[PDB]
């Protein structure tokens, strides 16, 4: 399986792709980004190889429900265009912790939230993406997982040396993924035959010595073709699904620095909205092109993807957890002709490079403006950039060192790992941002202490899970999309209360920083020609109405797809 791509013709495609990417990057190197590149880059930053691998694996093991996550992004993307980005533009902010500094004041909350978003990036993004790329390389090539990570990040470092490049990335990835989807669906015999054959993927080897595994452990779920699964016994329960995934997605899109940073570089508000719409329409695809291909991989490679014997799973992937995360790679490697196999390897690398370069740049911005600038108040621009570069290097090192914990991570389902860790560490951030933008009363001490409590609970559960890998069901037995809701509610209530206890932060410090005061001019007094254009969110009535209708139609399409897939 690993020797398939060794053909010279197949690798010709990857070298052509890399030459094209280098040419585009050099041309770009050698605020008017516009709607189609804004949306293309948002999609390419959101959809990395982490999504490919995790979504396909969770689709193989659990079914279509995981794909629904991506569709929720659609709705949240709409929010990002019409609720949060206008405020980030009016506030004239570059980073989100800088927005919280302007909103609340004081240095502790900015530093803390920057560090928390950096830890979130490290674990979820900079481990899942590199791990997924390593899976792709290891299944495609004999190189080990760690060596695969090393090669992948070397290639990414070459790649960085953005929105236009990410537009190329997303176009190539979308075309290649559509090609693979069509090819695999025809091979299985269409969607009807795919559904019929999917409820038969039971591996032949199901007993190890005298121990027989439970029937529900290895057979595909009866609800594998339903997004809304049982609230209690079904993995990814529908109430947890909707609410917890909406909270997590709110964090990721409307408060993470990467998405908002790429959304801010728009020429004007209309192109912000257009980029949001294009990214949403592109995000409507990742189900049909990542989840269903993984299910097809299960159908065609049941013994490899549905393994339940620890010995067999270990021999197939070196892990005794189930080999669930290698769904998409196998499909790409074993079912793709030489040229198309090379093209799909290029697609996976394209999505990964977009996501990882976006995250590297955003983390550099966060550490550069929100911590290093504060430690060295008189830092020169050159030293500032040097600090950012060293920070991304340290971030990469920490993420690589953290990879091994991601391997098992809830039975090898990488996307489950991503969503669980980010559910532990994101709901506090989402709560503070929602309250800050929508609630004037919140103040710096209250927000800081609410965040500290939320992080305390999240780290408590995370350490318990990592220690137990018999864990008490009263704490860890609840699915993490429900721990996300619990943590969000706890942080929300804590922030509200302790803010009502301490200080109002008068009212003249919240002009153009809160939703109620987004339009007031009133000579804002900060807690800490060109600018008039930068803080301008005016849009021509024609384009504004066109983009409003476009967003309504996009969310209509998202709801239609959700209901079509139950």
């Amino acid at each position: 399986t690993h020797e398939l791509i060794r053909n010279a013709a197949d690798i010709s495609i990857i070298v052509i792709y890399f030459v094209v990417v280098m040419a585009v990057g050099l041309w770009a190197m050698f605020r008017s980004m516009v709607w189609w590149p804004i949306g293309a880059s948002l999609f390419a930053s959101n959809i990395g190889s982490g999504h490919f691998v995790g979504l396909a694996g969770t689709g193989a093991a659990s079914g279509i429900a995981i794909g629904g996550f991506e569709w929720n992004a659609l709705v949240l993307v709409v929010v990002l265009g019409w609720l949060f980005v206008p405020i980030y533009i009016k506030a004239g902010v570059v980073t989100m912790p800088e927005y919280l500094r302007k909103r609340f004041g004081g240095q502790r909350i900015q530093v803390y939230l920057s560090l928390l978003s950096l830890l979130l990036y490290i674990f979820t993004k900079i481990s899942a993406d590199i791990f997924s790329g390593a899976i792709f390389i290891n299944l495609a090539l004999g190189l080990n997982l760690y060596l695969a990570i090393f090669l992948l990040l070397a290639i990414t470092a070459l790649y960085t040396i953005v929105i236009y490049t990410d537009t190329l990335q997303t176009v190539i990835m979308l075309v290649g993924s559509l090609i693979l989807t069509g090819f695999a669906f025809h091979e299985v015999g269409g969607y009807d035959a795919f559904m019929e054959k999917y409820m038969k993927a039971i591996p032949t080897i199901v007993s190890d010595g005298n121990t027989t595994f439970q029937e529900k452990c290895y057979t595909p779920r009866a609800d594998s073709f339903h997004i809304f699964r049982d609230p209690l016994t079904g993995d990814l329960p529908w109430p947890g699904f909707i609410f917890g995934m909406s909270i997590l997605t709110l964090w990721y899109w409307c408060t993470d620095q990467v998405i908002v940073q790429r959304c801010l570089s728009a020429k004007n508000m209309s192109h912000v909205k257009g980029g949001c719409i294009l990214c949403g329409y592109l995000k409507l695809m990742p189900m049909f092109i990542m989840v269903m291909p993984g299910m097809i991989s299960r159908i065609l490679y049941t013994e490899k993807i549905a393994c339940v014997v620890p010995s067999e799973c270990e021999k197939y992937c070196g892990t005794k957890v189930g080999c669930t995360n290698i769904a998409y790679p196998t499909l790409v490697v074993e079912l793709m002709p030489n040229g198309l196999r090379g093209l799909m390897l290029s697609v996976m690398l394209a999505s990964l490079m977009s996501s990882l370069t976006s995250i590297f740049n955003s983390a550099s911005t966060l550490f550069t403006m929100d911590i290093y600038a504060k430690v060295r108040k008189r830092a020169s621009e050159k030293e500032l950039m040097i600090a950012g570069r060293l920070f991304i290097l340290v971030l990469i090192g920490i993420s690589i060192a953290w990879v091994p914990i991601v391997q098992s991570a809830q039975s090898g389902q990488l996307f489950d790992y991503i969503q669980s860790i980010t559910s532990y560490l994101g709901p506090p951030i989402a709560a503070v941002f929602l309250l800050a933008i929508f609630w004037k009363r919140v103040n710096e001490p209250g927000a800081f202490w609410g965040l500290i409590l939320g992080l305390l609970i999240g780290i408590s559960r995370m350490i318990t899970e990592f220690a137990y890998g018999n864990c008490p069901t009263i704490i860890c037995g609840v699915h993490y999309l429900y721990f996300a809701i619990i943590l969000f509610a706890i942080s929300f209530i804590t922030i509200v209360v302790i803010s009502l206890l301490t200080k109002p932060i008068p009212d003249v410090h919240l002009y153009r920083l809160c939703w109620s005061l987004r339009n007031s001019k009133e000579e804002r007094i900060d807690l800490d020609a060109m600018k008039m254009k930068m803080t301008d969110t005016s849009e021509k009535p024609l384009w504004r109405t066109v983009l409003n209708v476009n967003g309504i139609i996009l969310v209509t399409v998202a709801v239609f797809c959700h209901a079509y897939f139950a």
Binding site: I552, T556, Y564, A566
Partner: peptide, 28 residues
């Protein structure tokens, strides 16, 4: 209830939702 019945019903209810949202936006 075929899947496209569900899709159309969801489109209808969500369109009503957006219509109510814009109605309140105009009124509020």
């Amino acid at each position: 209830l075929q899947p496209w019945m569900q899709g159309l019903i969801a489109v209808a209810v969500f369109l009503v939702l957006v219509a109510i949202a814009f109605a309140v936006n105009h009124f509020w």
